[PDB]
Write a protein that binds this DNA or RNA. Structure first.
Lengths: 60, 185, 134, 144
RNA sequence: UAGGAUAGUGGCCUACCAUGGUUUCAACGGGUAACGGGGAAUAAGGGUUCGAUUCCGGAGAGGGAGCCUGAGAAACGGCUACCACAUCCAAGGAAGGCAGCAGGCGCGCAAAUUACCCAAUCCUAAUUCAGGGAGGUAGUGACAAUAAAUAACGAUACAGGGCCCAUUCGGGUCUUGUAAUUGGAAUGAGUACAAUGUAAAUACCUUAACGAGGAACAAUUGGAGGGCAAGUCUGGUGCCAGCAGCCGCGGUAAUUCCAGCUCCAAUAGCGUAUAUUAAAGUUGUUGCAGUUAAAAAGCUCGUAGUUGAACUUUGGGCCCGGUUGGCCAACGGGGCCUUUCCUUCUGGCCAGGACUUUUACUUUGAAAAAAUUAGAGUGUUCAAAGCAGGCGUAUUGCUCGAAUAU
């Protein structure tokens, strides 16, 4: 029922975020090879068995 | 005003998109058999579902129904011929068995890994798709070729396309022509 | 180019079209895709029947290569090959000149312009030549 | 038998009875009363193109205290005025008055979506140049 | 009833006469963002939604109407008139019909070339030849559907994990991998001789000569609180901006916003909107609920509707043909006899007569358009497909198919 909220602060956080750049990284393969890259990463040499398995831990 | 050209979907994505058990079981298949997609497993699951529903449709009849005898013997011989169905297990209650790994074992990729000749399922996949191995004299570059019984004794390299003779190959040709340039004339 | 092979399969004698007709299976190992001229030469010196009465077509090579299957005809004369073949193959072999005309729609437009003229039209041509005095 | 006839000659009672009781379904009612073609500010279509009149700031009721940036749009095929949300951090700097936008629904099939009172639609394309690509800076809004 | 009309039946029309005809088993009217069907989507069974659109049937050529010609039209790439548009004009007159092909304007969320050609499929004609925007070819085409590149294998190196052994140094070989050093092989993406393809080409299938080392020839789309696979990492913001299908985040240490890194899911695809199907036993015949959650009429009578007790040749005995499975039982079948019409005569299941309770149910079969679905065979390289194809004396030829089911 309120229809005239002020539009001044629009785009605030997007425009005042600090711009950083993407880091140049080596290319991860695509397709079949990438699934192979996942496969050893999960089943063959599964590294952290802290409790069970963590696909993305922090700085633990 | 023509005749229509028919087609069909050959796969069916599962109903729950994220089950940890199914993702683990399908990455295990994709790593043991060297696949690209999960669609390369969903296609095999589609084949199993159609074969298996047809088998149930025959099992619900009585024995010595002529449709049961004809379609059962036909489906059994088609499953035996590609080596999916074993030789002792030949009676239509064994095609209701017969998991996905039995079809995923008989592809040209895995059979090229087994019969020497490839030393890896990834090397087998790349060997197949790079205009190597032939079955008859026919070069096949389809890693889901699904070899038969009477053709698995014919998987070998091409009469063209080196590792079968017939030329060195362009990186070997260039490395020779740069070996034949600096040292000599 | 290794002594390659010709094979003629499925041969039917057609005395009512005055020809032999067959499938041509060509093994050409270590050679891409032989020719049509050279296949006509190597069939004319097998059927002993004068290459301008030998026709070949079809001929897509196998996947992987080394083999190509097409169709062939051998007529009882060049005089009957000039009466039972289509004109495009008789152009291909050099046995009829490629009779060029104008385009499709240029012929259609010329037909439509002739449809508006009744008679030979030379009376109309001289009558509109007479128009230039008013 | 508890509530329904069962005898073999009683299919007319069953037909007319289920045909009467189907009207309590919301979907069947709105599909056989033609709500889509008369009500529901589109034509029952999926997207619709319209022209921005003014920019609104709609206050989110109850929770999520914020000003959702919306626009008031007059549809071309109807002339119906319609409030439409302009989704992302920014993007009211990309819509301007008297442009043309393409509205889509919110995936709630009516029923103004989140904490927004009355706004049933979102803006997809302004001036033909696709607000997602305008907000990811891979496309440039035209001159006029 | 009689006449007219018609190609012909007929209230089709006319004259005279009669008062009938339909309807709660839904007539009649209304709506249809309704052409009908074969079919399509959805996959327990039952269903539910869709079918403008490749085939069949119908209808229309701007809206109506009228008609000529002909075997056939109420024809519109024929005519006539009226209405609505709309074009040329020397102002008098003339000509019109893209819901054919291409194209344009408009409309809208929404859809291609003013291209080549009769070579194939077939049609037309006085016809072997001519013609065919039917049709085919190509341009555009992420509407859908098929297949499946974006790398593979080493060795060395520190580090393991195994273990022969451990009194106590470590590695050496069976190697799984983390390696910012390295190594030669392999391929098509492209380009291109030629040949093939083709009516002529383009593309495909072949193939010389080029064409892989990271600056490539570099994979994206959506997400990381739960649902729901995947962070409590870092910087920014501070109920602002914004996110969020739902529940919920944001008010200074935000796992949810804006970014970086990492990870996840699908992948040449992925997201969003709307509609529909499953989910949904939330439409319930299968198969819902009705004391209190929504819902037993206040009560009885009562018509159509739906439903409606039991009873009439049961049993026993003989014989014959089988079809599975190990002389044998079982499974069904048929003829006799047990107080037991078989519709009945005529002269050979025929064929003249005389008549006979009627349905519902069910088995079997016919007659059943293709395509689509199901399905048999077949190595389109696989596959979607297609209906092919396979074999020899491959210098003169043999043959299986193109089932079946619903």
């Amino acid at each position: 029922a309120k229809v005239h909220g002020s539009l001044a602060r629009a785009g605030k956080v997007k425009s005042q975020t600090p711009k950083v750049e993407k880091t140049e990284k080596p290319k991860k393969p695509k397709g079949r090879a990438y699934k192979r890259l996942l496969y050893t990463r999960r089943f063959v040499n599964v590294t952290l068995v802290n409790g069970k398995r963590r696909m993305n831990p922090g700085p633990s | 005003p023509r005749a229509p050209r028919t087609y069909s979907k050959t796969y069916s994505t599962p109903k729950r998109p994220y089950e940890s058990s199914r993702l683990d079981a399908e990455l295990k298949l994709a790593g043991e058999f060297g696949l690209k997609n999960k669609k390369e497993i969903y296609r095999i699951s589609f084949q199993l579902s159609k074969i298996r529903r047809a088998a149930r449709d025959l099992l619900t009849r009585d024995e010595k129904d002529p449709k049961r005898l004809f379609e059962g013997n036909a489906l059994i011989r088609r499953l035996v011929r590609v080596g999916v169905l074993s030789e002792d297990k030949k009676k239509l209650d064994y095609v209701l068995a017969l998991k996905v790994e039995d079809f995923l074992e008989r592809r040209l990729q895995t059979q090229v890994y087994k019969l020497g000749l490839a030393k890896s399922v990834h090397h087998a996949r790349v060997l197949i798709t790079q205009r190597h191995i032939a079955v008859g004299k026919q070069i096949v570059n389809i890693p889901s070729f699904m070899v038969r019984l009477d053709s698995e004794k014919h998987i070998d390299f091409a009469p063209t396309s080196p590792f079968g003779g017939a030329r060195p190959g362009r990186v070997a040709r260039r490395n020779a022509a740069r070996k034949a340039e600096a040292s000599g004339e | 180019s290794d002594a390659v092979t010709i094979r003629t399969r499925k041969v039917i004698s057609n005395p009512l079209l005055a020809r032999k007709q067959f499938v041509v299976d060509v093994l050409h190992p270590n050679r891409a895709n032989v020719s049509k001229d050279e296949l006509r030469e190597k069939l004319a010196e097998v059927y002993k029947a004068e290459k301008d009465a030998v026709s070949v077509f079809g001929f897509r090579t196998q996947f992987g290569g080394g083999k190509s299957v097409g169709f062939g005809l051998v007529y009882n004369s060049v005089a009957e090959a000039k009466k039972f073949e289509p004109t495009y193959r008789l152009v291909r072999y050099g046995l009829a000149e490629k009779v060029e005309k104008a385009s499709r729609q240029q012929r259609k437009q010329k037909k439509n312009r002739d449809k508006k003229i009744f008679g030979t039209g030379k009376r109309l041509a001289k009558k509109v030549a007479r128009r230039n005095a008013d | 038998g508890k509530g329904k006839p069962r005898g073999l000659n009683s299919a007319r009672k069953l037909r007319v009875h289920r045909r009467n009781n189907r009207w309590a379904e919301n979907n069947y009612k709105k599909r056989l009363l033609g709500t889509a073609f008369k009500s529901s500010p589109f034509g029952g279509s999926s997207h619709a193109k319209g022209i921005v009149l003014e920019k609104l700031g709609i206050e989110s009721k109850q929770p999520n205290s914020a000003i959702r940036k919306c626009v008031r749009v007059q549809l071309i095929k109807n002339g119906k005025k319609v409030t439409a949300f302009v989704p992302n951090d920014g993007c009211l700097n990309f819509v301007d008055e008297n442009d043309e936008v393409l509205l889509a629904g919110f995936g709630r099939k009516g029923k103004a979506k989140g904490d927004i009172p009355g706004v049933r639609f979102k803006v997809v394309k302004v001036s033909g140049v696709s607000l997602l690509a305008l907000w990811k800076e891979k496309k440039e809004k035209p001159r006029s």
